């Protein structure tokens, strides 16, 4: 029926590519070949009785063109690396310069399984989360507790255009 283009953005290392492989191929890997430029992956789900298909884009040199025609964007940071959370501010100034000003955004704290190495408290994030206009959740690609929920949330949230 519909075609939803979604982008994954965030600092390198935060976990975008494994999020994509978990959600779309139900696969994970500790060993990592760096992403050169951009990838997408696709999987179809149903929300509120309608068959949708989501197109997720996993993003140095920056062709601003790929931001074009994205209804939703997952902005991801590593809970265990404060700096990655720190750069979330610079990642939001960018996105308003180069992307639809009325786009649905979800903030994602990934690697929640690393409890003992946690460098970003859930409260501080969700505080900032609802302090702004972004939806918020924490995931683990590793354990895959919140990965399905996250997409279906944002996709449901998205479809809410009418």
């Amino acid at each position: 029926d519909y075609l939803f283009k979604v982008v994954l953005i965030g600092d390198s290392g935060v976990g975008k590519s494994n999020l994509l492989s978990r959600f779309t191929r139900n696969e994970f890997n500790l060993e990592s070949k760096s992403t050169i430029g951009v990838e997408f992956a696709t999987r179809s789900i149903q929300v509120d009785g309608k068959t949708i298909k989501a197109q997720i884009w996993d993003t140095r040199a920056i062709t601003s063109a790929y931001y074009r025609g994205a209804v939703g964007a997952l902005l991801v940071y590593d809970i265990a690396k404060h700096l990655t959370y720190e750069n979330v501010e610079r990642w939001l100034k960018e996105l308003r310069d180069h992307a639809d000003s009325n786009i649905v955004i979800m903030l994602v704290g990934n690697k929640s399984d690393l409890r003992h190495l946690r460098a970003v408290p859930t409260d501080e994030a969700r505080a900032f989360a609802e302090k702004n206009g972004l939806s918020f959740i924490e995931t683990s690609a590793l354990d895959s507790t919140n990965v399905e929920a996250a997409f279906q949330t944002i996709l449901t949230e998205i479809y809410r255009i009418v």
């Binding site: 050169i36 430029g37 696709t42 040199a61 063109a65």
Partner: protein, 467 residues
């Protein structure tokens, strides 16, 4: 000890072995490696058989003598292996002869060698028939005579496994072009073995329509009609027969494609390509294992009378269907793959007669004549399927090419080895230049920065569109 240190590490593989064997002038190393060949898996070393045999012919006796023991051993434990050696040995010499005569001799292959001769003989005869259809009818008749001799001690070396050939559905055979020494495609029935070398040839089973159809539909129709079809042992194979075309360049390209496939497999680059098996029988003649569920672009345009994009929509569904977007995806990945192969090997004579389209949407290049020193097109028809130059899927096509290039560089040495060894004492047109391999290395642009490569990918694409 510094050498021996490396050789005893995990890092030592058949690849490394061949490199040192080819380059090292130390007789102590050559002999050491000759012995070390045995520890490796037969399958892994098998892949390098064309290289090994080439070294044997054109290199110092010392090198040959280091190679010989392993070869003879394999030949003695596998007649399949024996066959491929003998065929390759002969083709690559026109030093060789002593071992060839010795290997085919005891130290009975007559059934197989006569079997193969007849297939070649058939093809040469079809030269007198100036039309495709006439050739086909002459083929079918003459193939039926083959059946008279059906249960016999022979097999198809192009097969992944050991087996006996039981039946040729001659009515199903077809000739692929109108040329003087035209190649022809045939279907072959076989009964699988656990090992050919120890097993009695099967007993005859008495003989009691051909149209455009998918492969699995073709197996059904043939099976139901076949005497042997009831048996669980029964499987259907296929090969293309080229009686007057050299396949030595074709074989070389195959190894490179297989390596590039592995490189992109080891790394995580979703390029797509399809290597097809090659069999050198002589410098004149060879066989090819064909891709099923695929037909030429040219004929796709003649039956449909459509444009490529239009054909996709007809055969898969509208751009809003899953089947299409999947097919489009398969298209884009196969385009980027083969582009890179064309560039690296400098493949020429590129047209829609030389590009096949499979049932999943992949394209497949086939004619690897005109490569390297011997002296790819991105048409708008192709760009349309990608959703246009501004399209996301088209941008992705460019993205894949860069990725696949970065991957290749990380394994450059594995590729050049295959070609560089092959150049030995060689009269192939692809080695005509003084700097065939040297230019090849330049084409990997190992010195370039990634920013530079982004630009290079762009430059490549612009060239590809002019036609």
């Amino acid at each position: 000890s510094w050498l021996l240190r490396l050789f005893e590490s995990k890092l030592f593989d058949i690849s490394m072995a061949i490199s040192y064997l080819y380059n090292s002038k130390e007789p102590g190393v050559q002999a050491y490696i000759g012995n070390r060949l045995f520890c490796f898996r037969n399958e892994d070393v098998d892949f390098y058989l064309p290289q090994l045999l080439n070294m044997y012919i054109h290199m110092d006796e010392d090198v040959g003598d280091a190679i010989k023991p392993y070869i003879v051993h394999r030949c003695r434990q596998s007649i399949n292996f024996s066959l491929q050696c003998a065929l390759l040995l002969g083709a690559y010499s026109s030093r060789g002869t002593k071992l060839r005569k010795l290997i085919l001799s005891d130290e009975r292959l007559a059934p197989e060698r006569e079997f193969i001769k007849s297939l070649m003989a058939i093809g040469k005869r079809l030269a007198t028939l100036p039309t495709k259809e006439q050739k086909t009818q002459r083929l079918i008749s003459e193939l039926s005579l083959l059946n008279h001799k059906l249960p016999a001690r022979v097999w198809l070396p192009t097969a992944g496994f050991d087996h006996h050939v039981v039946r040729v559905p001659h009515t199903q055979a077809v000739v692929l072009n109108s040329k003087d020494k035209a190649p022809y495609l045939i279907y072959v029935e076989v009964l699988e073995c656990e090992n050919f070398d120890t097993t009695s040839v099967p007993a005859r089973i008495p003989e009691n329509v051909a149209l455009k159809e998918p492969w699995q539909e073709k197996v059904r129709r043939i099976r139901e009609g076949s005497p042997y079809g009831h048996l669980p042992n029964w499987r259907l194979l296929s090969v293309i027969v080229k009686c007057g075309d050299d396949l030595r360049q074709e074989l070389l390209a195959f190894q490179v494609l297989k390596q590039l496939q592995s490189i992109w497999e080891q790394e995580r680059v979703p390029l797509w390509i399809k290597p097809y098996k090659i069999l050198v029988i002589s410098a004149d003649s060879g066989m090819i294992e064909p891709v099923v569920n695929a037909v030429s672009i040219h004929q796709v345009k003649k039956q449909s009378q459509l444009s490529l994009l239009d054909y996709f929509l007809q055969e898969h569904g509208s751009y809003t269907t899953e089947a299409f977007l999947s097919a489009q995806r398969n298209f884009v990945q196969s385009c980027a793959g083969y582009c890179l192969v064309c560039y690296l090997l400098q493949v020429k004579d590129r047209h829609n007669g030389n590009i096949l389209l499979d049932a999943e949407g992949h394209i497949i290049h086939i004619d690897f004549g005109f490569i390297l020193s011997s002296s790819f097109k991105l048409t708008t028809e192709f760009v349309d399927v990608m959703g246009g130059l501004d399209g996301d899927m088209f941008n992705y096509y460019k993205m894949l090419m860069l990725q696949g290039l970065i991957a290749a560089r990380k394994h450059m040495d594995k590729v050049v080895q295959i070609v560089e060894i092959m150049q030995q004492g060689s009269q192939l047109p692809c080695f005509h230049g003084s700097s065939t391999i040297r230019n090849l290395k330049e084409r990997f642009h190992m010195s370039m920065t990634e920013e530079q490569l982004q630009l290079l990918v762009e430059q490549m694409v612009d060239g590809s569109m002019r036609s």
